[PDB]
Amino acid sequence: RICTNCCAGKKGCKYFSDDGTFICEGES
Amino acid sequence: KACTLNCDPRIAYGVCPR
């Protein structure tokens, strides 16, 4: 689950945190 | 498809399709 990168985290897929606090538009 | 690793330092929910 936690290991870094938007394949499931930061820079690749869209991303929300905990509640829904955005972090990566799958490339950010 | 998927990844051997690659999975957020602290992120949680993700939406690859848009």
Side-chain angles (χ1 to χ4, degrees):
Chain A
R1 190 196 176 283
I2 192 290
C3 96
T4 313
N5 190 91
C6 263
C7 191
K10 181 247 283 300
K11 307 270 181 206
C13 281
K14 261 43 95 290
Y15 286 97
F16 309 81
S17 266
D18 165 73
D19 56 283
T21 35
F22 198 86
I23 333 81
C24 141
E25 58 185 76
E27 49 104 280
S28 269
Chain B
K1 50 262 176 179
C3 285
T4 175
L5 289 158
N6 301 263
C7 353
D8 75 73
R10 260 127 283 246
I11 288 132
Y13 165 43
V15 196
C16 309
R18 309 148 290 106

